[PDB]
């Protein structure tokens, strides 16, 4: 991955497809991990997205991949980043119920809509979809158009959302194009791109994907990803091991206090070692 | 309310009860508002807490009351505050099913437990419970002990939580005391206080309360309150009106960009006026 090249494509076209983002054992392990949640149906509750953190670090580590961080840093012009959201989801074929197309929309907004988005600099949002099955035109491909400003459409429509009806925005639907991709490919896109998910045309099978999005902390009304966990929880061990494996630049996206932060004292270094035995505290020592 | 006096009681004892925080029409309107959600049962789904924002600003405005902000600013030593959570809840009597006591616990932790809490300065958390019914010993009073450090108990127990079992911490249960309060009273407490909810002993009726908690933005791994809303939503009008009514110091707790923030430009001032017609933009003009 060439961070500057990918960030330039995001800026100009709104999206970039990275083939072979995962290969080898990393791909095999990620596929196995997501299949623990969404097994080969060969289901109602299994249509729901499952939020981070997952039961396997073969999924948890990917939204924080150093290559992804590098792209986002180049596009936004800041290193002060946060993971906004991450989840896994399966989209099932027609044998498992009616599958519908989403409306074209942007994802430029924070969840609360507290203030209107900006599509420039540190206010941009970057989305990723890591496909863990081969995606064809009959397995619910993502559709993309272009950045909203390039298309001359507003981020807030007259209907009061970031979605574009077919009756009001016909040209968007004529220009949309599907993204087909091999398993292990990563689609990156900016939140202000006009895009949608699509219906899974095929009868059997399901599309498997890991989703995430990242924002700059300067957009302070935006929430980072919310989850609840305590050391007593059965899933804590996996998360604890994730924190030990991550480098400081990656933990930063979870809101971890950075080197030099006032949080760090002899007592909090001690408590960090207690909660995450084996963690490297040297970057944080006062 | 005397902010410095209340903050001193919070620092020394861990809690302070403010009688008559709401009086007059403000109290009557808040009671009516919460009763739209939890009517006089004279219910299963009605036992669930409902999160902010509410359908009435007679509830939404209270976690942001200037008097509450002043207390928290004095205790934490910073004005860079965020609302962590707010919700309303009813606790029903025994006629509506078995009511149980919570274990004593602290609420010193962020939801993700990402790093261990600090109970000093800007890392303190402040909780409020605004009681909207009269609370007696038979209507599920809050129980309090004292700050964890004062009691010599850890914020992380050997069980891996912030809760204190009766078998491991018997002295805490012998020292706990109920808080009785008239309707319109506000209980404030620090997150590191050992406390619990209790069973509603009475057969009929329910306790009504509005809950909120606030933290300092320096504790950057902590999440501010998460909600989803867009201008198309039926509840947007109420929230829009709330934003117009609030002063800058209050909007700050929602993550609103402060005066002088790089977010503010001619274009974003325009978009702010469009989304919140009538809002005073003068504090934010570049």
């Amino acid at each position: 991955m060439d961070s500057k090249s990918i960030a330039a494509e995001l800026a100009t076209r709104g999206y970039a497809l990275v083939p072979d983002f995962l290969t080898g054992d990393a791909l095999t392990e990620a596929v196995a991990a997501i299949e623990t949640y969404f097994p080969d149906p060969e289901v109602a509750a299994l249509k729901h997205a499952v939020p981070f953190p997952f039961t396997s670090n073969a999924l948890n580590r990917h939204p924080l991949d150093l290559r992804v961080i590098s792209v986002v840093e180049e596009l936004l012009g800041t290193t002060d980043l946060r993971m906004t959201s991450s989840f896994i989801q399966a989209k099932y074929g027609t044998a498992y119920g009616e599958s519908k197309d989403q409306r074209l929309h942007n994802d430029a907004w924070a969840a609360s809509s507290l203030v209107h988005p900006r599509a420039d600099g540190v206010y941009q949002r970057v989305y990723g979809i890591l496909y863990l099955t081969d995606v064809t035109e009959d397995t619910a491909p993502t559709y993309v158009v272009d950045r909203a400003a390039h298309l001359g459409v507003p981020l807030l429509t007259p209907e009061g959302t970031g979605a574009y009806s077919k009756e009001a925005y016909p040209e968007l639907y004529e220009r949309e194009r599907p993204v087909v991709v091999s398993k292990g490919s990563l689609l990156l896109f900016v939140g202000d791109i006009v895009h949608r998910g699509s219906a899974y045309h095929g009868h059997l099978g399901r599309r498997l994907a890991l989703f995430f999005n990242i924002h700059g902390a300067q957009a302070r009304w935006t929430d980072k990803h919310l989850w609840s966990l305590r050391p007593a929880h059965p899933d804590w061990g996996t998360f604890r091991d994730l924190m030990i494996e991550l480098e400081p630049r990656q933990r930063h996206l979870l809101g971890f206090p950075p080197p030099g932060d006032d949080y760090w004292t002899e007592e909090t270094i001690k408590h960090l070692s207690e909660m995450y035995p084996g963690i490297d505290v040297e970057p944080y020592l006062p | 309310m005397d902010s410095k006096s209340i903050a001193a009681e919070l620092a020394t004892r861990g809690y302070a009860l403010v009688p008559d925080f709401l009086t007059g029409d403000a109290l009557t309107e808040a009671v009516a508002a919460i009763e739209t959600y939890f009517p006089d049962p004279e219910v299963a789904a009605l036992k669930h807490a409902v999160p902010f924002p509410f359908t009435s600003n007679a509830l939404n405005r209270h976690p942001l009351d200037l008097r509450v902000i002043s207390v928290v600013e004095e205790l934490l030593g910073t004005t860079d505050l965020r609302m962590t959570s707010s919700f309303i809840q009813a606790k029903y009597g025994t006629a509506y099913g078995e009511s149980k006591d919570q274990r004593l616990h602290n609420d010193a932790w962020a939801a993700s437990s990402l790093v261990h809490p600090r109970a000093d300065g800007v890392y303190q958390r402040v909780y409020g419970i605004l009681y909207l019914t009269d609370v007696t010993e038979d209507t599920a009073p809050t129980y309090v002990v004292d700050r964890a450090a004062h009691l010599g108990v850890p914020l992380l127990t050997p069980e891996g939580t912030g809760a204190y079992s009766k078998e491991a911490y018997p002295e805490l249960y012998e020292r706990e005391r109920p808080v009785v309060v008239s309707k319109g009273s506000l209980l404030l407490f620090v997150g590191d206080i050992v406390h619990r909810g209790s069973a509603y002993h009475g057969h009929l009726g329910r306790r009504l309360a509005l809950f909120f908690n606030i933290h300092g933005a320096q504790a950057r791994w902590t999440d501010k309150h998460l909600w989803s809303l867009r201008p198309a939503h039926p509840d947007w009008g109420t929230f829009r009106d709330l934003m117009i009514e609030l002063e800058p110091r209050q909007r700050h707790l929602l993550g609103f960009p402060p005066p002088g923030d790089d977010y503010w430009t001619e274009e974003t001032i325009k978009h702010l006026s469009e989304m919140y017609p009538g809002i005073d933009v003068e504090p934010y003009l570049p």
């Binding site: 729901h48 997205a49 959201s85 989801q89 | 998460l226 989803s228």
Partner: peptide
């Protein structure tokens, strides 16, 4: 809908 938090007008939503 098909998420884990808030509501999309049907059930819990992606956030």
């Amino acid at each position: 809908w098909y998420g884990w938090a808030s509501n999309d007008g049907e059930g819990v939503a992606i956030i």
